[PDB]
Amino acid sequence: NKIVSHLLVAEPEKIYAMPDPTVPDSDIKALTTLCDLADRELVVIIGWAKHIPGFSTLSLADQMSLLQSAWMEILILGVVYRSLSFEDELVYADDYIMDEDQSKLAGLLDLNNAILQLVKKYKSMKLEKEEFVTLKAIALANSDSMHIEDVEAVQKLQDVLHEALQDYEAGQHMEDPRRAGKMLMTLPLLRQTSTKAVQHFYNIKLEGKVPMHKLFLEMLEA
Numbered sequence: 001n002k003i004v005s006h007l008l009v010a011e012p013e014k015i016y017a018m019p020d021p022t023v024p025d026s027d028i029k030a031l032t033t034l035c036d037l038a039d040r041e042l043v044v045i046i047g048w049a050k051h052i053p054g055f056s057t058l059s060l061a062d063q064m065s066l067l068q069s070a071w072m073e074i075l076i077l078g079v080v081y082r083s084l085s086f087e088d089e090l091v092y093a094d095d096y097i098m099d100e101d102q103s104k105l106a107g108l109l110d111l112n113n114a115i116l117q118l119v120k121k122y123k124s125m126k127l128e129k130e131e132f133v134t135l136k137a138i139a140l141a142n143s144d145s146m147h148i149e150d151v152e153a154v155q156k157l158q159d160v161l162h163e164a165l166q167d168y169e170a171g172q173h174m175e176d177p178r179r180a181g182k183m184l185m186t187l188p189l190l191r192q193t194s195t196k197a198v199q200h201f202y203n204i205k206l207e208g209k210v211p212m213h214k215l216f217l218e219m220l221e222a
């Protein structure tokens with residue numbers, strides 16, 4: 001499938017978390033580091049989305065609405081995929097892999113465990129990079145924003161991305177005629193974990209103890 005191959009080459013380069021070596025470890029350092037990483041990823045995600053067929057033709061508003069509703073799912077799918085060959089560890093970046101203890105002192109035990117639940121299921125399904133990038137695009141198009149202007153156009157985008165997944169699976173996984181649907185059935189857990197993550201960091205935002213940059217702040221306040 002061409003769309004899949006296109007998404008593959010449009011995949012952005014890895015990013016480093018770069019936790020400050022002079023700062024003492026604490027929940028504030030972890031959260032600050034993670035949100036800092038996320039801010040930089042959002043910049044790249046925005047650029048990445050321009051490569052998705054038909055995305056740049058939507059109105060700026062609709063493009064923004066889709067992103068404001070899907071940003072967390074995209075960010076989470078990323079750490080999920082990066083962590084597939086690991087055990088009980090989340091690879092936020094090559095230089096930032098969180099084990100159970102780290103999640104604990106960062107107050108992210110329940111959230112990271114949900115992310116690990118996502119990882120568990122994808123490991124069992126043997127999620128391929130081709131499927132990961134297509135799911136990321138589908139997640140963006142199917143984000144369910146409450147403010148979409150051109151419903152049909154967004155539906156059209158969802159349809160083209162779904163067709164790519166179906167096409168890919170029909171030609172690459174003939175042994176399982178229902179693999180495309182299984183992939184789609186993983187989206188609910190992604191959506192569920194993201195809704196909680198957004199609520200969690202929104203609260204962290206209110207507490208005011210963790211500095212956050214412009215873009216991250218913009219998505220979170222959406």
Ligand SMILES: CC(C)(c1ccc(O)cc1)c1ccc(O)cc1
Pocket residue numbers: 034035037038041072075076078079092108111112115197
């Ligand atoms: C949004 C968040 C700061 C993040 C940062 C970077 C990333 O690649 C993916 C997600 C995050 C959400 C939930 C979570 O449990 C840990 C980190």
Ligand code: NA
Pocket residue numbers: 070073138139140142143144191
């Ligand atoms: Na979605």
